[PDB]
Design a protein around this nucleic acid. Structure first.
Ligand code: MG
Ligand code: MG
Ligand code: MG
Ligand code: MG
Ligand code: MG
Ligand code: MG
Ligand code: MG
Ligand code: MG
Ligand code: MG
Ligand code: MG
Ligand code: MG
Ligand code: MG
Ligand code: ZN
Lengths: 116, 83, 177, 66
RNA sequence: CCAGGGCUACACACGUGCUACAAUGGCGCAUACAAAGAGAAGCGACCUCGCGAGAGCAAGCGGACCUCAUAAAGUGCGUCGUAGUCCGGAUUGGAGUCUGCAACUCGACUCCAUGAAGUCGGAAUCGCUAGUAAUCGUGGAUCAGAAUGCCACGGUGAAUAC
């Protein structure tokens, strides 16, 4: 029970425990096992040793754990240094997707700062 | 974003301005009120000073500014902080 | 010591070419590989010092030597003589059998492994690198852990300058970049 | 070495996904399974393709044609 | 009169809401049950593609005829078995669709990757006496597009008043 450079849990089922990978959800893991040919409600423990081999050849084509953490950090830092409207909001901690910042901007700004 | 069967959007005048800029070959700052036009790859390497409601602020287009729009580099509000 | 016979037969004759040595004793070799856990949180309790030495003894199969404070400083809140770390000195037959698992088994298991630096040889051949995770070794069980440690590697060698030690380890196909 | 203080140490045999059945000496006690030997890991062909900085103009002219 | 900008700004303060903190629940699969409405530059069957919002070709109706239109909670079966979880959905990355001269400021929606706070809330305070409260859907007006708002409708359906 070790898929894609991380450890994936033992006693969770097939499609659920693959979602520990940074890069798959409930849908894309159904694409893994329907292509490979495994039923979806067995655990990742008591999968045979001819089953963990090919399962990463399904995983390797996706842009995953280290390959996906870098291009997001490359995307956001590319928005930083052009001078676009998006990157100004990425370097000032104020949200990007149009939302109201007069009130309810408590995620990008963090919880409430008292006046000092 | 605009649809892809429609294609990109640009003003007909700024397309004629940049073409007349490259064909003549100037580095004069083109001032244009088209924040809603998408930048074309002939606009790379030019100074195009797009308006922000108050004045004209220059933009020298590098490579990574192709699929963007001109208004993103002309900030239209102004803010230093409250205290 | 698998890789030591590989040193004797093929790595020596390689390095004799590219540096024009005029004696068989002049070619570089490695002396020792030292593994340090600086465990500063033992001043709170000895409980975390005891389980850090169970890690690094299982990794490299010798008993670890507990180090002590050389001088008593207040910026770190330690006296003179508090146990503040451990270490293992590996030499000879047991040295290459760490270095066999190192550049084959242990190092490519690092999460987001990109490769190692090469400006990191401090002038006189000695390479020192640090690892961020004791989990990477095939010894410690991933579930039996309790607290994450970290250590480093120090490959002391008999290279004269900064250049000969980079070329020494490159003939052990070291994973630089 | 001192015959009492040290942990056990013995030849084990390590198996990887690259088809390697490799022999070391290690303090595990049981046998070993691997995923990345240093003969298969993306270190000599992986860092090349994974960058993919990409042509900015070809982002623009793959979308459409004038 | 015109173009762009602003009415959408944010150390922060209060009022009204929606969604939550899970098993009286989440997901998957099969499957029963409404009322009230609008519709011509309008609503837009089926067929054909598309992971999907949609697109193509294009009938049907100025309407108890036709379409909008599939009610949902529920029930049958199956799983997950108390974890920040197969709970929660914010938030950001890359793709899109659409209406619209025109979606950077400053639209809704789709698909995929990311997966915050939150485990029932101090003092204080509000609504409600029966088809009420609670609950779960559904339509409409403003309107090119843009409802957690406003107005309207049925399904389930209590506790208690010395
Ligand atoms: Mg995941
Ligand atoms: Mg005006
Ligand atoms: Mg207003
Ligand atoms: Mg308040
Ligand atoms: Mg959910
Ligand atoms: Mg259930
Ligand atoms: Mg279809
Ligand atoms: Mg929390
Ligand atoms: Mg989702
Ligand atoms: Mg609980
Ligand atoms: Mg309407
Ligand atoms: Mg409307
Ligand atoms: Zn493998």
């Amino acid at each position: 029970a070790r898929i894609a450079g991380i450890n994936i849990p033992d006693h969770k089922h097939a499609v659920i425990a693959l979602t520990s990978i940074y890069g798959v959800g409930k849908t894309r893991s159904k694409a893994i096992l329907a292509a490979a040919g495994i039923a979806e409600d067995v655990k990742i423990s008591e999968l045979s040793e001819g089953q963990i081999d090919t399962l990463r050849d399904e995983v390797a084509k996706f842009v995953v754990e280290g390959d996906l953490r870098r291009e997001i950090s490359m995307s956001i830092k590319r928005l930083m240094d052009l001078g676009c409207y998006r990157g100004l909001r990425h370097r000032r901690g104020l949200p990007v997707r149009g939302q109201r910042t007069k009130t309810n901007a408590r995620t990008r700004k963090g919880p409430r700062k008292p006046i000092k | 974003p605009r649809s892809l069967k429609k294609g990109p959007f640009i003003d007909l005048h700024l397309l004629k301005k940049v073409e007349k800029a490259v064909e003549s070959g100037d580095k004069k700052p083109l001032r244009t009120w088209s924040r809603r036009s998408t930048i074309f790859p002939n606009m790379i390497g030019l100074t195009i000073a797009v308006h922000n409601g108050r004045q004209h602020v220059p933009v020298f287009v590098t490579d990574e500014m192709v699929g963007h729009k001109l208004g993103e580099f002309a900030p239209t509000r102004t803010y230093r902080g409250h205290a | 010591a698998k890789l030591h016979d590989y040193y004797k037969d093929e790595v020596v004759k390689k390095l004799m070419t590219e540096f024009n040595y005029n004696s068989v004793m002049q070619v570089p070799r490695v002396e020792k590989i030292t593994l340090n856990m600086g465990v500063g949180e033992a001043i709170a309790d000895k409980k975390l010092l005891d389980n850090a030495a169970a890690d690094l003894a299982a990794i490299s199969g010798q008993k670890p030597l507990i180090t002590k404070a050389r001088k008593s400083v207040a910026g770190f809140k330690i006296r003179q003589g508090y146990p503040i770390g451990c270490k293992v000195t590996l030499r000879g037959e047991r040295m290459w059998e760490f270095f066999e698992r190192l550049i084959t088994i242990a190092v490519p298991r690092i999460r987001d492994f990109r490769g190692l630096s090469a400006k990191s040889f401090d002038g006189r051949g000695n390479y020192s690198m640090g690892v961020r995770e004791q989990i990477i070794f095939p010894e410690i069980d991933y579930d039996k852990v309790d607290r994450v440690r970290g250590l480093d590697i120090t490959i002391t060698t008999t290279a004269k300058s900064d250049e000969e030690g980079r070329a020494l380890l490159a003939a052990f196909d070291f994973p630089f970049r | 070495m001192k015959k009492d203080i040290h942990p056990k140490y013995e030849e084990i045999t390590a198996s990887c996904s690259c088809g390697n059945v490799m022999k070391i000496r290690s303090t595990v006690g049981h046998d070993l399974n691997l995923d990345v030997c240093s003969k298969c890991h993306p270190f000599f062909t992986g860092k090349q393709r994974d960058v993919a900085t990409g042509g900015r103009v070809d982002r623009f002219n793959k979308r459409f044609n004038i």
